[PDB]
């Protein structure tokens, strides 16, 4: 972040500022003034393009170009590291559970995200594999339990419909006595119906209305 | 000229003077589209209608005659408001004793539209079910023994031994509002039952891939397995 | 001839400070108040030499303002250059994502062709090769009958249906199973004692 | 882009005389040609007032510029009610001079000619019939564009424009049958049958044959610098009483 | 580099003055209290002075002086609120342009967005490229959610043209402002990237000619009964002709009857009083170009429309290319039909006004709009 | 005509009884394509039309709602209907349902009845999801709420807490509570839509 | 990088014009001059070297702090999956509670329809009545 | 070019003054050279300031040109990012990728169905069972049969009850 300004500030305030102030005229600690001014005049005379304020801008741009060409290799090699399940491949709710604050919990989207995460530090790899297996078993048991709950709900619906129907058709609160004596109401029914067949065997003695009686019996016992 | 068309008029004079996009006012053609095309095999007949002083009573009975052998009837009685038209009360006078427990939990929604549509779609679904099952009778009576069970909800075929039961259950709604069908199969190889999950996957694949009328015939072809 | 005087005064202050920076070590010969009071003498010598130079002499071109403009231009240059580096990183990331998506699509197309080619070699003769109007009449007969098939369990990518762990994760299914077994046995005993399959069969 | 402009003439005027006065007034050498053209060379005309007389009167200036070269095409017939008319292109300033001479030497009444809608239809009908030397008529086809511009309330509908390409135009005229009037017997009944828009009642602005002409309600723009015999015959036939 | 509401951009003051001169006093007072409770600057004792100025009947230049020179632009949020209130106040001067939101197979996708969590994701995805600011509000009269996206650039920060996107509540059709720059493509692509969160969405455009107001484009393409009928079928999109089944049967259409004029099927129109017949002819034109009953302006004024009628006679393909223009096309065609200039028995369906504000080829008598 | 009025009254009340079913077919002609034969003077319709009338019966107000019309026109070169006009709003994909039924080609009347039944079930589930929340608002168990046009995204209040639901076809698929303890109350309500009424009284007892 | 800074520094010193103009009284000056002009290029070559190690480590630790805002670890994902596992365990718990309520309803129905008796005798009576009814029906 | 003339004038004036101070120099001797160093610093810093003004002007012009180049590359990178993101979004939501996805799903369904069919035809003849109920459906049938047996309206006790009363009705 802002490396060009740091390079140019290094070039200006550390390289040119030290090679100009005391690197030219303050060399007389080991020494008169005339020979030091002559050598300083020759030095600033036969140098006046290298330490300009416009050549060092080009050198700063060249140093930035070198560091950008070295940063390019590091950026294209920093994405080819050990990836370890990166983003854009998990589900929506998984990568919302990563960042925190989901604000809306669901079960269908969580199931569709858990049944989508891939498979494979090695102890953490085994722990993640066991956790993936456990969560997939959670989703399997969730779907099986939901289907069995719908089936048992329809079952209790039919049971409650039968009990409400017999309570309305009886209106006497004798539901337990209804099933126990259902055999009793049927043994007196077929015994009394045999008396009607005995009264219709050799009393009418017909042959054309017998077909109508047989059709009425076989269409009332079936329709 | 200028004409004033009415409800009862011939179609040619209706079509001469037709420059709007409104429905045709011919009541016989409109009742023909309402009766022969959108709701076939249904005999609606209004029995009586009275009024008070502001409401209008209306007794109408239906006869769902898609099954011609033993159709079930029902009879309604509705109470209007006849201006700012709401529906105050509606009650059921008589039901033919065949759908009476099936239309017991359904007829407590206090929504007559859902009960009418559910009864019509239920008898249509029952007619399609007995058609599919009778088609499976007619193509298997010479090779196997094939008898029905319960009421009609599970056809059973048997050969050599090996048995196969094809469930077809229609569940009326109660505690969507249209009746739904459920198809499940179960095999027996003489000894014991097979795995229900593998049979459910095979049935789901063979019905999702082929169909319902031609899908179950493939299931009987696999349960034969003398040739392939 | 006033901006030159201002620049000469600024350079005079800077050079007086730079000479005092060496006078801080060159004052050990002679004391400490003999340099802070003697500095005003030599500062007046530069104040009289600038006074004589003021009579020996014009755009308003200053060094500090144009140096500040250079610093502002350089700071905006570094900001736009850093923005270009950030957009280069974003473009490299999106190009890598595009290449991964394209290789995924091409790999799945090649795998589809390979699986369709090997599906011919294997044995699918009687029940599947009658179609391979097929999957479009099921939707007709499913929106016609309101069909609810037995929905299979969702795909787990080779994590098989461990029925033991599913049954152990729902401890009520075993109780429901045995209760349904006792209920079915009770209803079967009530049905067989009534002879429902006997008298309804001989009658028709 | 030679925008013609049409006027009327109350008396059949021969220009054998007076042209010396025009050469005196303008000090140029204007030219004439005495053609006796004949419209509808097909023999189903009966030859009853069928011959016209055309006086093409050029201002003999060279072709270094186009606005300086302004024809004056007359046409006339001594059997009708309004006997002649004149049409001129260009924007040269001698046009007012020759109009002033034609008024002040012959004593004729000039009025500008405004076209109706069916006259514009008959003008686009006759601006495509090409002429041949083998006394037979051929038709070239152009992609027309009938441009309308009505005056509705609140300027609801400002301007609309039917446009018919060349191949569909040819297909319509061949589907009608063998005729020499496509735009009045094939195209306009087709537009009325398919859109309901009666074109001879709608406010036509400018029938535009693409590339060839651009008819308007007052003027005619033409690609070449001349007009056909059938166009001027339709123009003279339209302004009768 | 995403901008907060307290940031003050650079802008001239005369354009904010001309913006504030287009508002009434009461919304200016409400904006004053809202920005002072939100931001403040130079509690409620200061606001009590403004309560007398509206109660006295003072000029608007004084109150825009008061609101422009105690916040001495204001910031980005108050500028967004000013421009959005100008959008609400005078809506007939903007210009919207629709775009459907497909997905996956090609089936359309109902949006169903939340106006809090969407703005954070859109501002985050747009902040990685430019300096964005996103301000979403809800229209008081219509059920839309007009987003306003404004992108800034650096030579403070200069301001570009703001880009509005108007989401309806439950439709796959998203309207937006007409712009063909790179900023329109960036904002629309970022919206199509961050509205999804589950599976990818593409914004294909459904129309090329922009529609004027926001009531008009909501009537045409938003969630409404008039989205498909729009023409002579407008009697079905308002249910003028049928009552409930529980209603009275004495006042039925099939019992009272309607008054109709006998149509002519012989071509006797091109060869051409009793004001009952005049009233019925005007009612017939009104029935054909509208529902069943100013006096020419349609339900939605449509500016530019051009068809391409492709018939087929004796194995030829005969194309004609009608191309209309104006302020209200089908009202003008109604007026031309009313001056007896166009036969009304031969006006087809697509010319009467159905599939309104669309334009495309007509093969086999079936309209199919242009891509 | 005084017995013909009684016959017309019987026909009208039979039409109303048939319209109470919800899904009805009604005849149509388009006034553009009425053509004459010119050999007998009789008028025949060129392209047949068929309109569907879907009219959902409300229950909270006990009166029928505004009807929704779907009009099919017969294609001139295929003998199959296509979706001409419809007044069904844009959150129901009507052209997608019409391309989904029978593959895309609708020929017979029951093939159109299946299409009518699918769009009718969508209209009924939208009406039911609106009516359940309105009846919750009427009993003061929830406070002032906002609805969508299809009522698939609601945000009502409780005595203190604001609850946001994204509800699918008569089941809640996503709950949101804003103001560890919040997640249990969020997956509490994440069920059906009548069980939501059973649960919102289970906390305010 | 450093190969440009060394050229820029050693190309601007007193080693560029003094080796051209070069008895012993003028030899002790320019020998000690370039030797003390070698002290500056020693301490500054360590300055330009230490700066780029400071610069690149400030750039490398920035780039490593930008990739981990787009990549995931194997510890936060495990914590999120623990939270999702707790969520699904709570969902399975309330589902099992509903199943327990429904099988309690089944247990309430189960004792309502029982009949502990010896009802094969009435079953045999029904079979005998069936035989008598078949005898009375088939002989008619 | 007033900067060069001011440089020449200031250099000549300060050089004459510095030569006078140097001749005066040759607080016994450490006082005179302080003003000499001050005059040399004034001349050096003044000519350095003039050279700095010229170099800063030409450097600011060059930096403004290169900043314009970097803004051009910024617009180029903006268009490139937008086009790459557009092709990415039109790749994932296209007909071809979804079509091959559904073809892969259909091939997987057919492979699993044929594998299950082959295993079923194997366990019929060549070389499963049930021991628990994890997904069963043999319970709703028996309950439906029991409800249709003990119906108080139709049932089987009432089907006989509408026969024995109808048997005496034919008498």
Swiss-Prot record, chain A:
Its main location: nucleus. It is found in: Nucleus; Chromosome, Centromere, Kinetochore. The keyword Cell division applies. It comes from the Eukaryota. GO terms for biological process: attachment of spindle microtubules to kinetochore; cell division; meiotic cell cycle. GO terms for cellular component: kinetochore; nucleus. The keyword Nucleus applies. Keywords: Cell cycle, Cell division, Centromere, Chromosome, Kinetochore, Meiosis, Mitosis, Nucleus, Phosphoprotein. The modification Phosphoserine is found at residue 207. Belongs to the NKP1 family. Component of the kinetochore, a multiprotein complex that assembles on centromeric DNA and attaches chromosomes to spindle microtubules, mediating chromosome segregation and sister chromatid segregation during meiosis and mitosis. Component of the inner kinetochore constitutive centromere-associated network (CCAN), which serves as a structural platform for outer kinetochore assembly. Component of the inner kinetochore constitutive centromere-associated network (CCAN) (also known as central kinetochore CTF19 complex in yeast), which is composed of at least AME1, CHL4, CNN1, CTF3, CTF19, IML3, MCM16, MCM21, MCM22, MHF1, MHF2, MIF2, NKP1, NKP2, OKP1 and WIP1. NKP1 interacts directly with OKP1 and AME1. This is Inner kinetochore subunit NKP1. It comes from Saccharomyces cerevisiae (strain ATCC 204508 / S288c) (Baker's yeast). The gene is NKP1.
Curated annotation (Swiss-Prot), chain B:
GO terms for cellular component: COMA complex; kinetochore; nucleus. One of its GO terms (biological process) is mitotic spindle assembly checkpoint signaling. It comes from the Eukaryota. Signal peptide: none annotated. Keywords: Cell cycle, Cell division, Centromere, Chromosome, Coiled coil, Kinetochore, Meiosis, Mitosis, Nucleus. It is found in: Nucleus; Chromosome, Centromere, Kinetochore. Belongs to the CENP-P/CTF19 family. Component of the kinetochore, a multiprotein complex that assembles on centromeric DNA and attaches chromosomes to spindle microtubules, mediating chromosome segregation and sister chromatid segregation during meiosis and mitosis. Component of the inner kinetochore COMA complex, which connects centromere-associated proteins and the outer kinetochore. COMA interacts with other inner kinetochore proteins to form the inner kinetochore constitutive centromere-associated network (CCAN), which serves as a structural platform for outer kinetochore assembly. Present with 1254 molecules/cell in log phase SD medium. This is Inner kinetochore subunit CTF19.
Curated annotation (Swiss-Prot), chain E:
Keywords: Cell cycle, Cell division, Centromere, Chromosome, Kinetochore, Meiosis, Mitosis, Nucleus. GO terms for biological process: attachment of spindle microtubules to kinetochore; cell division; CENP-A containing chromatin assembly; chromosome segregation; establishment of meiotic sister chromatid cohesion; establishment of mitotic sister chromatid cohesion; kinetochore assembly; maintenance of meiotic sister chromatid cohesion. It is found in: Nucleus; Chromosome, Centromere, Kinetochore. Present with 606 molecules/cell in log phase SD medium. Component of the kinetochore, a multiprotein complex that assembles on centromeric DNA and attaches chromosomes to spindle microtubules, mediating chromosome segregation and sister chromatid segregation during meiosis and mitosis. Component of the inner kinetochore constitutive centromere-associated network (CCAN), which serves as a structural platform for outer kinetochore assembly. It holds the Pfam family CENP-N. Transmembrane segments: none annotated. One of its GO terms (molecular function) is structural molecule activity. Disulfide bonds: none annotated. Coiled coil: none annotated. It comes from Saccharomyces cerevisiae (strain ATCC 204508 / S288c) (Baker's yeast). Belongs to the CENP-N/CHL4 family. This is Inner kinetochore subunit CHL4. The keyword Cell division applies. GO terms for cellular component: kinetochore; nucleus; outer kinetochore.
From Swiss-Prot, chain G:
Component of the inner kinetochore constitutive centromere-associated network (CCAN) (also known as central kinetochore CTF19 complex in yeast), which is composed of at least AME1, CHL4, CNN1, CTF3, CTF19, IML3, MCM16, MCM21, MCM22, MHF1, MHF2, MIF2, NKP1, NKP2, OKP1 and WIP1. NKP1 interacts directly with OKP1 and AME1. This is Inner kinetochore subunit NKP2. The keyword Metal-binding does not apply. One of its GO terms (biological process) is chromosome segregation. Residues 73-115 form a coiled coil. It comes from the Eukaryota. Its main location: nucleus. InterPro entries: Nkp2/Cnl2. The gene is NKP2. Keywords: Cell cycle, Cell division, Centromere, Chromosome, Coiled coil, Kinetochore, Meiosis, Mitosis, Nucleus. Belongs to the NKP2 family. Present with 1630 molecules/cell in log phase SD medium. It comes from Saccharomyces cerevisiae (strain ATCC 204508 / S288c) (Baker's yeast). One of its GO terms (cellular component) is kinetochore. Component of the kinetochore, a multiprotein complex that assembles on centromeric DNA and attaches chromosomes to spindle microtubules, mediating chromosome segregation and sister chromatid segregation during meiosis and mitosis. Component of the inner kinetochore constitutive centromere-associated network (CCAN), which serves as a structural platform for outer kinetochore assembly. It holds the Pfam family Cnl2_NKP2. It is found in: Nucleus; Chromosome, Centromere, Kinetochore. The keyword Transit peptide does not apply.
